[PDB]
């Protein structure tokens, strides 16, 4: 669950997928158990330190590849520019709705970030973007209770 690969969908073969397991992020370890056992994700933003111009986008889909009691659509987040890019156009924690990935335990399952049109031989649009992408940074807001 800690890898890079091209996808196996029928239209995702040219998408570059990256994934990590929550088990290997060692989030739980930051605070001693006495502070609480239920530690869940509230919100995830994605930072993609690629070189994009002022009028240049990035395309990527972040999703949770496991079982969780999520409302439909909360299983995935889209990235459009990468500058600490949240899923929604307007971010607030007070709109009365659950946020993408909200409620997922900090140590369970796997996240995958899919970059469509990545393959270079296929002249994918993200094929050049990716060659300037130095890292992938997640910002995980989670709560302890």
């Amino acid at each position: 669950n800690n890898n890079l690969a091209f996808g196996a969908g029928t239209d995702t073969k040219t998408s570059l997928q990256a994934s990590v397991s929550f088990a290997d992020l060692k989030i739980r370890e930051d605070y001693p158990a006495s502070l609480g056992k239920i530690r869940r994700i509230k919100q995830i933003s994605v930072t993609l330190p690629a070189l994009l111009g002022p009028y240049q986008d990035v395309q990527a889909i972040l999703s949770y590849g496991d079982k969780a009691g999520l409302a439909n659509g909360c299983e995935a987040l889209a990235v459009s520019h990468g500058m600490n890019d949240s899923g929604q156009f307007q971010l607030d924690f007070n709109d009365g709705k659950f946020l993408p990935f909200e409620g997922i335990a900090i140590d369970q399952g796997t996240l995958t970030l899919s970059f469509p049109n990545a393959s270079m031989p296929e002249k994918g649009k993200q094929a050049t973007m990716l060659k300037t992408l130095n890292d992938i940074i997640l910002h995980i807001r989670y709560t302890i209770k």
Binding site: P49, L51, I137
Partner: peptide, 11 residues
């Protein structure tokens, strides 16, 4: 020639 883009990467 590929230029760096200011503000693009915190590192």
């Amino acid at each position: 020639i590929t230029l760096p883009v200011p503000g693009a990467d915190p590192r």
